[PDB]
Amino acid sequence: LQPPFNIKVTNITLTTAVVTWQPPILPIEGILVTFGRKNDPSDETTVDLTSSITSLTLTNLEPNTTYEIRIVARNGQQYSPPVSTTFTTGS
Amino acid sequence: MLQPPFNIKVTNITLTTAVVTWQPPILPIEGILVTFGRKNDPSDETTVDLTSSITSLTLTNLEPNTTYEIRIVARNGQQYSPPVSTTFTTGSLE
Amino acid sequence: MLQPPFNIKVTNITLTTAVVTWQPPILPIEGILVTFGRKNDPSDETTVDLTSSITSLTLTNLEPNTTYEIRIVARNGQQYSPPVSTTFTTGSLE
Amino acid sequence: LQPPFNIKVTNITLTTAVVTWQPPILPIEGILVTFGRKNDPSDETTVDLTSSITSLTLTNLEPNTTYEIRIVARNGQQYSPPVSTTFTTGS
Amino acid sequence: MLQPPFNIKVTNITLTTAVVTWQPPILPIEGILVTFGRKNDPSDETTVDLTSSITSLTLTNLEPNTTYEIRIVARNGQQYSPPVSTTFTTGSLE
Amino acid sequence: MLQPPFNIKVTNITLTTAVVTWQPPILPIEGILVTFGRKNDPSDETTVDLTSSITSLTLTNLEPNTTYEIRIVARNGQQYSPPVSTTFTTGSLE
Amino acid sequence: LQPPFNIKVTNITLTTAVVTWQPPILPIEGILVTFGRKNDPSDETTVDLTSSITSLTLTNLEPNTTYEIRIVARNGQQYSPPVSTTFTTGSL
Amino acid sequence: MLQPPFNIKVTNITLTTAVVTWQPPILPIEGILVTFGRKNDPSDETTVDLTSSITSLTLTNLEPNTTYEIRIVARNGQQYSPPVSTTFTTGSLEH
Amino acid sequence: MLQPPFNIKVTNITLTTAVVTWQPPILPIEGILVTFGRKNDPSDETTVDLTSSITSLTLTNLEPNTTYEIRIVARNGQQYSPPVSTTFTTGSLEHHHHH
Amino acid sequence: MLQPPFNIKVTNITLTTAVVTWQPPILPIEGILVTFGRKNDPSDETTVDLTSSITSLTLTNLEPNTTYEIRIVARNGQQYSPPVSTTFTTGSLEHHHHH
Amino acid sequence: LQPPFNIKVTNITLTTAVVTWQPPILPIEGILVTFGRKNDPSDETTVDLTSSITSLTLTNLEPNTTYEIRIVARNGQQYSPPVSTTFTTGSL
Amino acid sequence: LQPPFNIKVTNITLTTAVVTWQPPILPIEGILVTFGRKNDPSDETTVDLTSSITSLTLTNLEPNTTYEIRIVARNGQQYSPPVSTTFTTGSL
Amino acid sequence: MLQPPFNIKVTNITLTTAVVTWQPPILPIEGILVTFGRKNDPSDETTVDLTSSITSLTLTNLEPNTTYEIRIVARNGQQYSPPVSTTFTTGSLEH
């Protein structure tokens, strides 16, 4: 299909962080943002957003831990490859 | 009966963007619904289902010099808390 | 899940000093972390671990005409509450 | 090493009090402030601050009780002699 | 550990009078202590022991153009809650 | 002992109308009493018994350029919570 | 050093299960028991017990989920290869 | 922490008779406790203390078509091996 | 102040084994400590450290006709709830030992 | 974390019937699950789904002189409280069957 | 397919009642029990049970209120006509 | 006036301990028992009891901590010298 | 609040015999309760009421290699001294 890009994590505190990204050039119906500990696939949490939202602020993360964020665009039953990034919370 | 989100705030309002922030209720919840769209335009209402661990969104593609309403509800199974809302207007070419 | 400190206030701001005050959560806690430093400068962040029985600090040696962020977290063992923060700017020689 | 000085206690209420002091003339890494009932060494509570903080406000003290405050500067494994003071809360 | 009184307000301030109002904590208490007197004058401090069912006092004989501090504590046996206070200045002949 | 309604607000005040809004207490209640009428006129006081699921009323036939007081109490059987009130004045032909 | 055998998961319900095993032919100074969702390495917990304990009841399990249980015998420094069994909780 | 017995087998089961046999522990022990009774009944049990030089018993006077359980425990000093078990069922009456 | 485990029950007592079961306190905890041994004895005491997920153990290597004490403690951080305990006595023999 | 039903009591036991009663957790729930069958058996298990309004059942078709297990679970959404259970044994016969 | 009979509502109090019935002449794979305020269709609840259960106790009822109880037997696909009874709770 | 003797601290755990003592040769109208952390005067508590009580169980003690227990007999005005013992709680 | 006995000693312990001896209280009393039985068994106990003019008893018919406990209580009016104890163990069989 057609994915997002330029995922960037800001203001990483002890248990919070700001995620920002750029929407796809092609029209899409929605966007799937997934986050959680990098070595725990049963920890992932996902939200479905509109193409007009460009950032989230996350809370309740665990201190000094490495998380991975994946953002995938969707249109019908077509999903774009994910754009991901990683970051670790303060210690 | 469920406690609603509180202290909703809208910042960094520009011609076409706005940042929304709020705090979850005291007790644990399954999700938080955020509804936004042109003030009093039942037609133009968008809703997003979030995890209570998210506390802010940045909206884009908002139309200049327009009034928008935002309502935030906390859900926990068969229950929805009353909403907490606010109204804001985007900057204008003036 | 832990309730955060609230009602943070910054007073007596001068060219180089500021007074910070806040209130602890309802329930008992082991300590309160206060993080301060130049706004959005991940490099310049200082953290202090305090006893919940302390409610105010006076900062000195702050650089004139500068924006500072302060975040206050409450800890109780394996848990940290979400933070409550505020932003303030020191006076200037203007 | 090199200690603080001029410890002064202000606005002594029923369960609160304001402690202020002057930092060392020589560069130090941190500062240790200890407080509690004068006749109870198992009651002392301590905090480690930076040389730039010059006052604390204390709460949850017991009414009409005598407390002692000690402030010690540190640099490496070198600690300065303590500067202390005493005060009693309202009755 | 005890919850303090909150939302203290001072109104109808004149050259020599002021009205003080507040709300008791959530849980039941034995009494509420109200301390008033010239700002930062440990000598000039008056304290009154009240029943939690009282929520306002009108002070008179206050000296014109003067700053006053008021602290309100809630007591319940062997415990006193941290205080909630405010500062106000009486009108002046100006 | 019962928790009172809170955050009372009066909006869209005109020459003769006003909108009143508030939030119920945390815990469940049987009803909410809303008392309104000319400020400090014991004679002119109207009271309405509502279900806690109602959070706003629009008053009409208010007299121009007049001060009105509104008190809201929460009842739950043999108990009434202390009131939360506010004062407002209707617009004037000026 | 011989391991336990005949590991048996009994009385399986929606959220609990009973785990029992027959201690080795040779005496052992202790036993290590591990359990958790079969398809997950992060979720895994272990307890060290005296060889005199032969059964344990697990609670707070997730419904209709497959779990794996590993048990190893020890004598301070020497351990034995593990003994394993897997089971699934009720569903409805 | 004490060596256990094993390989308990029950043969020649009749209406009221049964032959019980087992393998003594690998390490020497002072005695072996052999317990038996109806499986249903936690209060029926009968125990005899034997030595490892004995490896088989013939039980009699049992009831027809009944389920019995046998438990064996080895003892040495104040230590007792974890119990080893097996159950069997006596034959049923024809008529 | 940290609620202790409770409703401890010793069941299935035999010559040398017994079953112990309980219930964890209402709020989550880091671990459960189960200590057991002869009552009239301090030297003989075994402590086991469990996750609050576990609510039962089957003990073996118990001496016949002997009295035992079991205590269960809840641990959170460095705090320990007062213990909850019980006593029981293993069944005894009717026939004699050998010569 | 969802408080379970409790104070389960088996009463009026006969050759083939028994009465079971309990108390629902303090806070409302979607349903109560009562499972019952022979204790020494996995194949034999009947689960019934009740409203929290119901606090008792009378069971029949129980085999004489047999041991039974009853477990009660509280369900809210997709969460299940740990079960609360008990055991009992139906009365037995003294006279024989026929030929 | 024969329905239960002799439905009896016993031990009626202010908020509880005991419901018992005699199972059919013919074996049945199950039974459906329904109860609620007689004058109300919205308020009505049903539970499916094994025919081996013959009594049930209702709690949290409303005082001095009339309730109706319906019971129907089934064999997966075939049901029987219902059997009904009505009762009233205590008042004071 | 003779004091108690053979003070014994038994069943010591992580946070509790059992205290027992043998009353004097001569009758006594009462007994005072004091306990607290050995190295601390501020932390110390005392209870007055009837001489008919011979044992008491302490709870909420601090882990791996040394405590001292003092007991004194009395007859209203006359007391006896104290009898002391010290013990330490479990640690892990 | 009542004077107690003391210095209970158990001598000449055999397989089933034991001599018990004690010291009467300092203050006069009306009687002395001497209780004995297996220490393990809280329900075995046997009690005899004696006078201070008697200071020793010989127990017989005891069981071999068993641990017994003796408790003595002095009584005067409705007052009873705090119990004094000691335990001992009968000899064991050779063969």
Residue H5 DSSP SS3: coil
State how far Cα H15 lies from the chain centre: 18
| Bridge partners of residue D16, in order along the sequence | none
Give the whole-angstrom CA distance, residue M10 versus residue M87: 8
| Contact (CB, 8 A) for G12 and G52 | no
Substitution target in I72, I80, I84 with the highest count of L β-carbons within 10 Å is I80
Judge contact between G17 and G9, C-beta under 8 A: yes
DSSP G23-76: PPSS--SEEEEEEEESS-SSS-EEEEE-TTEEEEEE-SPPTT-EEEEEEEEEET
Amino acid found at M34 = V
Please give the Cα distance from A55 to B55 (Å, whole number): 11
State CA B21 to chain mean position distance: 8
Specify which residues F3 forms β-bridges with: none
**Residue I88 burial (C-beta neighbours within 10 Å; 0-12, 13-18, 19+):** middle
Q: Which residues of H touch G (CB under 8 A)?
A: 1-4, 6, 25-27, 81-82, 84
The distance of H19 to chain I (nearest Cα, Å) reads 20
Q: What angle do CA G63, G69, G71 make, to 5 degrees?
A: 160
Angstrom distance (rounded) from CA G43 to CA G62: 12
- In this structure, chain C runs to a length of 94
Rounded Cα distance, H23 and H74, in Å: 11
**Minimal CA–CA distance to L25: which of M33, M7, M10?**
M7
Cβ-defined contact of K56 to J59 (cutoff 8 Å): no
Resolution of the experimentally solved model in angstroms:
2.4
All structural domains of chain C, each given as residue ranges with its CATH number in brackets, are 1-94 (2.60.40.10)
Q: What is the DSSP string of C27-56?
A: S--SEEEEEEEETT-TTS-EEEEE-TTEEE
- Sign of the Cα torsion J4, J10, J11, J14 reads positive
Single-letter residue type at F91 = G
DSSP, res A17: E
Cα-to-chain-centroid distance, residue C65: 18
Count of alpha carbons within 13 angstroms of residue D12, beta-carbon side: 16
Q: How far is M82 from chain L (nearest CA, A)?
A: 7
Give the list of residues 6+ apart from residue I86 with CB closer than 8 angstroms, or none: I8, I9, I10, I69, I70
**Residues in M touching I88 (Cβ below 8 Å):** none
d(CA I51, CA G45): 8
Paired tokens of D20: 């202020």
F47: Cα separation from own chain's centroid = 9
Dihedral over Cα of D85, D90, E5, E6: its sign: negative
Q: How far apart are CA A50 and CA A30, in angstroms?
A: 5
Contact C25, C72 (CB under 8 A): no
Cβ(E45)–Cβ(E37) below 8 Å: yes
Cβ neighbour number for residue J18 with a 10 Å cutoff = 21
**Strands, E assignment, chain J:** 6-11, 18-23, 31-38, 46-50, 54-59, 67-76, 79-80, 84-89
Q: 3-class DSSP state for residue E16?
A: coil
Nearest to B56 among A23, A50, A56 (CB): A56
Residue K21 corresponds to which amino acid?
A: W
Compute the half-sphere exposure of residue G19: CA atoms within 13 Å on the CB side of its CA.
Answer: 29
Rounded Cα distance, H72 and C30, in Å:
54
Using DSSP's 3-state secondary structure scheme, residue L63 falls into: coil
Q: Measured between alpha carbons, how far is A14 from A8 in angstroms, rounded to an integer?
A: 17
d(CA D89, CA K20): 71
Q: How far apart are the first and last CA of chain A?
A: 39
Residue B84 near residue B8, CB atoms below 8 Å: yes
L41 DSSP assignment = S
Is residue M73 within 8 Å of M80, Cβ to Cβ? yes
Q: b vs e for L55-86, b when ≥16 Cβ sit within 10 Å of the residue's Cβ?
A: eeebeebebebebbbbbbbbeeeeebeebebe
C-alpha closest to that of J87 among J16, J13, J31: J13
> Which of I33, I21, I34, I42 has its CA nearest to residue I70?
I34
Nearest by CB to residue D53, choosing from C21, C52, C57, is C57
Angle, CA B90 vertex, CA B15 and CA B21 arms, to 5°: 105
In chain E, breaks (C-N over 2.5 A) are found after none
- Find, among I86, M41, G16, A50, the residue nearest to B47 by Cα: A50
Residue J30's nearest CA partner among J84, J78, J83, J85 is J78
Q: Which three-class secondary structure string do you get for E7-75?
A: EEEEECCCCCCEEEEEECCCCCCCEEEEEEEECCCCCCCEEEEECCCCCEEEECCCCCCCEEEEEEEEE
Q: What is the distance in angstroms between the Cα of I52 and the nearest Cα belonging to chain H?
A: 25
Length of chain H: 95
Q: How far apart are CA C29 and CA H46, in angstroms?
A: 59
* Separation CA M48–CA M40 (nearest Å): 20
Contact between A72 and A32 (Cβ < 8 Å): yes
- What's the residue count for chain A? 91
CB K1 within 8 A of CB K79: yes
Residues of C with CB under 8 A from a CB of E: 23, 26, 28, 55
Q: Which SS3 state, helix, strand or coil, does residue L78 take?
A: strand
Pairing mode, strands I6-11 and L17-22: unpaired
Q: Do J83 and G11 touch (CB under 8 A)?
A: no
| L55 touches L18 (CB < 8 A) | yes
Sign of the dihedral defined by the CA atoms of residues B59, B61, B62, B64, in that order: positive
Query: Are the CB atoms for H24 and H51 separated by under 8 Å?
Result: no
Residue D17: count other Cβ atoms within 10 Å of its Cβ. 22
Q: Which of B54, B59, B66 to mutate to test the interface with A (most CBs of A within 10 A)?
A: B54
Tell me the two tokens of residue F85.
């009130």
Q: Which residue of M has its CA nearest to L23?
A: M82
The rounded distance, in Å, linking the Cα atoms of C16 and C63 is 6
- Strands M79-80 and G17-22 turn out to be unpaired
The CB density around residue F36, as the number of other CB atoms within 10 Å, is 22
CA distances from I90 to H32, I1, I44, I63 (A): 17, 34, 16, 7
d(CA H9, CA H87): 9
> Which of L22, L25, L52 minimises the CB distance to M26?
L25
Distances G56 to C41, I5, I84, M28 between C-alpha atoms, Å: 53, 17, 19, 60
| Chain F interface mutation, best of E9, E11, E23, E29, highest count of F Cβ atoms under 10 Å | E23
d(CA M83, CA M36) in angstroms, rounded, equals 12
Residue pair D34/D70 in contact by the 8 Å Cβ criterion: yes
Query: How far lies I91's CA from each of H4, I13, I65, I88, in Å?
Result: 20, 7, 5, 10
In 3D space, the residue among F30, F2, F32 whose CA is nearest the CA of residue F20 turns out to be F32
d(CA D35, CA D47): 9
Strand runs (DSSP E) across F1-94, as ranges? 6-11, 18-23, 31-38, 46-50, 56-59, 67-75, 84-89
Using the CB atoms, write b or e for B12-46: b if 16+ within 10 Å. Answer: ebeeebbbbebbbbeeebebbbbebbeeeeeeeee
* Helical (H) or strand (E) element with M3: none
Best D35, D45, D52, D60 member to test C by mutation, with max C CBs in 10 Å, is D52
Question: What values do phi and psi take at E18, rounded to 5?
Answer: -155, 145
Helix or strand holding residue A88 (H, E): strand A83-88
The answer to whether the CB of G83 falls within 8 A of the CB of G4 is yes
Report residue J36 as tokens: 């019952």
D87, D18 in Cβ contact below 8 A?
no
What is the Cα–Cα distance from K23 to C22, expressed in whole angstroms? Answer: 70
A80's CB contacts (< 8 A; 6+ apart) are A1, A2, A3, A4, A24, A28, A72, A73, A74
Give dist(CA G84, CA G69) in Å, integer: 6
Q: Taking phi first (over 0 means left), then psi (-120 to 50 degrees means alpha), and beta for anything else, what does residue L86 get?
A: beta
Report the alpha-carbon distance of residue H38 to residue H71 in Å, rounded: 12
Q: Kindly state the DSSP code that residue L43 receives in the 8-state scheme.
A: S
Closest residue to E28, CB basis, from F1, F3, F82: F1
- Tokens of residue C68, six digits: 């500072």
Q: Which two tokens stand for residue I63?
A: 């001496």
Task: Say which residues have a Cβ less than 8 Å from residue E4's Cβ, sequence separation at least 6.
Answer: E25, E72, E73, E74, E81, E82, E83, E84
Instruction: Give chain A positions within 8 Å (CB) of C71.
Output: 13
User: Among E31, I62, F30, L2, which residue's Cα sits nearest to residue H33?
Assistant: I62
* Contact indicator for C82, A16 with CB cutoff of 8 Å: yes
Of E87, E91, E84, nearest to E7 by C-alpha is: E84
3-state secondary structure of F66: coil
Rounded CA separation I54/I73 (Å): 13
Nearest residue in chain I measured CA to CA from J83: I23
Nearest to C93 by CA among C11, C2, C15: C15
- Alpha-carbon distance of C94 to C15, in angstroms, equals 10
Tokens matching residue F62: 């208010």
**Encoded amino acid at B27, one letter:** L
**Spatial CB neighbours of J95, under 8 Å, sequence gap ≥ 6:** none
Looking at CA atoms only, how far is residue I98 from chain M in angstroms? 11
C65 backbone φψ class: left, alpha, beta (φ>0; ψ -120 to 50): left
Contact between A30 and A74 (Cβ < 8 Å): yes
Question: At a CB cut-off of 8 Å and minimum separation 6, what does J56 contact?
Answer: J19, J20, J21, J22, K18, K55, K56, K57
Which pair of structure tokens corresponds to residue E12?
């109808």
Starting from the edge strand earliest in sequence, which strands make up the sheet with B31-38, in order? Answer: B46-50, B31-38, B67-75, B84-89
Give CA A37 to chain center in angstroms: 12
The sign of the torsion formed by the CA atoms of D67, D68, D71, D76 equals: negative
The Cα I90–Cα I68 span in angstroms is: 8
Reported in sequence order, the residue ranges of chain D that DSSP labels E, i.e. its strands, are 5-10, 17-22, 30-37, 45-49, 53-58, 66-75, 78-79, 83-88
Tokens of M3: 């004077």
Q: Would you say I54 and I32 are in contact if contact means Cβ atoms under 8 Å apart?
A: yes
Measured CA to CA in angstroms, residue E14 lies from E7, E44, E66, E89, F39 at distances of 21, 20, 11, 9, 22
Residue in L89, L16, L87, L88 with CA at minimum distance from that of residue L57: L16
Q: Are strands I31-38 and K53-58 parallel, antiparallel or unpaired?
A: unpaired
Distances B73 to B29, B76, E10, K63 between C-alpha atoms, Å = 11, 10, 36, 36
Phi, psi of A9, deg, nearest 5 = -100, 130
Residue pair I15/I91 in contact by the 8 Å Cβ criterion: yes
Q: Which residue of D has its CA nearest to E70?
A: D13
Q: What residues are paired with I59 via a beta bridge?
A: G53, I18
Across K13-92, the runs of DSSP E, i.e. the strands, are 17-22, 30-37, 45-49, 53-58, 66-75, 78-79, 83-88
Label residues F47-71 b or e (16+ Cβ within 10 Å = b).
Answer: eeeeebeeeeeebeebeeebebbbb
Q: Are F8 and F24 in contact (CB under 8 A)?
A: no
Q: Using CA atoms of A25, A26, A29, A34 in order, give the dihedral in degrees to the nearest 10.
A: -50
**Alpha-carbon gap, residue H22 to H34, rounded angstroms:** 10
Q: Report chain J residues whose CB lies below 8 A from the CB of H95.
A: 99
Is residue E52 within 8 Å of residue E30, measured between CB atoms?
yes
Q: How far apart are CA M5 and CA M25, in angstroms?
A: 5
- Phi and psi of B11, rounded to 5°? -130, -175
Q: Looking at this protein, which amino acid is placed at residue C4?
A: P
J80 near G14, Cβ under 8 Å? yes
Contacts of I97 (CB under 8 A, 6+ apart): H31, H49
Q: Do chains B and A touch (3 or more CB pairs under 8 A)?
A: yes
Cα distance between residue A73 and residue A69, in whole Å: 13
Asked if F81 and F73 touch (Cβ cutoff 8 Å), the reply is yes
